[model samples]
Target chain A: NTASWFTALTQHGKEDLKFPRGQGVPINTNSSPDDQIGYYRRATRRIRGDGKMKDLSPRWYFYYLGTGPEAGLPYGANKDGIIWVATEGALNTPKDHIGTRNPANNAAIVLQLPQGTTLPKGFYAE
Target chain B: NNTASWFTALTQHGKEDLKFPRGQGVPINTNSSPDDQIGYYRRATRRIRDGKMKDLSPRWYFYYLGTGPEAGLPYGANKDGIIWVATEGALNTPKDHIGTRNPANNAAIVLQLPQGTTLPKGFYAE
Candidate 1:
């Protein structure tokens, strides 16, 4: 009969290690054993690096963190790394180098991501 | 009671000129005339030098002729003066040099107006 098994690994002082066995499945340490014990150890080592391992709770750690694929994190750059463009009906519409008040001509007002910054894979509008 | 007058001027084969007048505003042959005739003649000559002149009727002769300011004439250029980008949801979306499927990364697919070509003064969307 097959059943679920859960185990925890703990280290004692110098050379002592605790290995508890349950009635469900026996833990085998060999690479080619019936139990995938080596593979589980490798996966656990990959997840745990320093002593602070297991501190991070796995609660849906989305790959692209802030603002889901739809709503992008809006950012712009000017002289001081911040560019603000006025709304459509705002008083002072930005003008280009040639004194034209056209948004298409105003490249300075356009939002540009810094080099090496990964933008979310989605659509963006001005 | 004053009435509108019609007049025509013609050169005679003899040593004289002929001026015919009808009931209405009389045409005067001097720099300063009561009819302000010089102004009328100057306006007429200005319209004539460009023949195939009246052939083009004054039917709402819109300044931005080909397409109205609203509907701009669509044109694009690539290698041989034609750049065609597929519509969204098309079979093959263009990919950037870095192999990104995002349109923002595909600079080559974006429409770029050539220099010296005046785009209509209006909004355009990609």
Candidate 2:
């Protein structure tokens, strides 16, 4: 079934769009659809424009294509976007030491890739 | 409580300090100090990060101390950070596998002054 479905999508757009059917966006674990058709309720795991602001749960950041309340690139601030963090040595939960409990001392480190620094492919979305 | 019972034990109580221990048959000669967490970061970036093929998983990003935790940078990621990734090994989980995983994938080794040979002076924390 998956084989034929992928072949069909590829046949539909050989060069137009990336129908990342198998590469990502797997079917819902909740919806028991026979064909996974229609917008059946399924827990999505990516960011949306109108979503809550201060939430910190990890999720995919879908960028906007245009501007002016539509295109996600507002203020032309689209420099680099993080894609998939290599899972090689990923941690189950993040640690927080750079932060401080001291009122006397509080600071953090700043990392700046030089002006012409080219990030490797697949690491960033922006 | 900060300055507890651990007094400056380094001071020679009597005249034993007047004699050179090395000349007196105690083998000792060494020089080493952690170049901050930066030293480890450079090692990763050079040996495995940017240098590795994309297939081999190569990418440069911040790690800890002052902390950036997306990579779960156990250090800088948290101003409350300490006890960052104390152990970094190969692709295999260092804790469990089959047989002796060998030097290429050894479990966290203790061979230092701070975390290794035993830093009677102890280690640093941000």
Candidate 3:
């Protein structure tokens, strides 16, 4: 089950994939509000790089299957899917995207892509 | 890092703990609408036991920091925290708990509590 699932996510040109834990995750390096960042819940509470996380850029996108301040993500009534895009990642998501700056907390689905990748239409890293 | 996070989640009357992955979780067993159950995103993707999950009991509370239809959960901007109440679990959450039946997905924070436990005040299993 694990292998198959991981395989599917890697289809986005991910050279390496991992699920690391971190805090104060930024949605992108820069954005209009500047406060457009994601957070980790302290489940008492709780991503990536070298798979060691250094910093985020416009190429990196955080995907989840709900709605809030996190833009470009599919909403609650849309479907059930989760994905995290790295420098060279992309996803097939729903249109009419909406998100919240304030998102829920959980483990992130991080994908390290092969560079030159960009988020799909309507999805923005900034 | 792992041990400490686990320790905090167990503060709520958890007797045994495990983090197994599953699908279609529920905020409460019964609710105003039958569609109130939670769903898992397919990361191409994606608990508990001995510790195994059967069905949710009102005593079991699923806590994550965000907002939506899973009522009783503290909304975004409140704090960073996560907890999964079993038959005997409780939590110290913020006031004005707000959640959505539409929740994001990832690994769940599951705690198995000794029987006789209950959710904290202002929280409801159903």
Candidate 4:
């Protein structure tokens, strides 16, 4: 029997999406500040090619469940019901990005479960 | 052309094998000390079923090559042309264990390449 339980999922695009254009963009090329420009260029190109237009919107969803409070789970508990989700290669597609994605394209959503209860069945770790 | 190079491989059992039956074994079950006994028991059972018997040597080898010193590569460097290797599941089998393995099981091997050069062709990241 488990003690505490929670559910987690990686969902994409539930709100307005924003891209850090111009000088607000983070460096992506390498681990150096001087590489910011190159990083921005590469990131912009990548985002565009992946169908991420300036104001285009792509949406997707992921789901998970856990048991017990001391489970020491991975992703769960935050804004929305999403812990973390990623979109790469295809817009709105849930893809695993362990070693992929330059500057890694990913997102996360988390929702606090009931104060003290187990998550409903059908939601388990991935 | 690149500058500086190296290659690495994780090989299982290329030397004497020893198993700590009394103590010396690293704790596994959890992040506690009193849990050592429990951890050792679980580990021993796992090893035995996975075909790792006391005094028995299961041998396996992994191979890798890298190019350029500043490449900032992963998994390549040091000792006996061998770095680290792990045996899980079937004995002598090389399995990927990023998240699996309680207390995890894996190994790596690293070997220094020529003083100044790039890895030979056909060696790329995994």
True contacts kept of each: 0.00, 0.00, 0.00, 0.00
What TM-scores result for chain A when each predicted structure is judged separately against the true chain A? Answer: 0.15, 0.18, 0.18, 0.17
Runs in model 4 with CA error above 4 Å? Answer: A1-126, B1-11, B28-30, B39-126
Off by over 4 Å in 1: A1-68, A72-126, B1-126
Give the per-residue lDDT of model 4 (tens digit) for A1-126: 111111222213333222222222121332233211111000011245565555422322222111112112332234332233211221321111111111122332222322333422332222
TM-scores for every predicted model? 0.14, 0.14, 0.19, 0.19
The TM-score obtained by model 2 is 0.14
User: lDDT by residue for model 3 over A10-76, one digit each (tens)?
Assistant: 1233222222322212333222232222211110101453666543322323432222223334322
lDDT tens readout by residue for model 1, A1-58: 1111222222222322212221111222221222221101101122455675553211
Docking class of 2: incorrect
| lDDT value for model 2 | 0.20
- TM-score for candidate 4, residues paired by index: 0.19
Cα lDDT tens digits for candidate 4, B1-126: 321111122122335322323222222212112321211011011133345555423322222112122122233233333332221221222112211211111111122222332332333222
Worst 10 residues of 3 chain A by lDDT: A1-10
Query: How accurately is candidate 4 docked according to DockQ?
Result: 0.03
Against the reference, the lDDT scores of all candidates come to 0.20, 0.20, 0.26, 0.23
Instruction: Choose 1 or 3, whichever is better by lDDT.
Output: 3
Kindly give the number of clashing pairs for every candidate.
3, 32, 23, 22
Query: Residue A63 error for model 2, in Å?
Result: 23
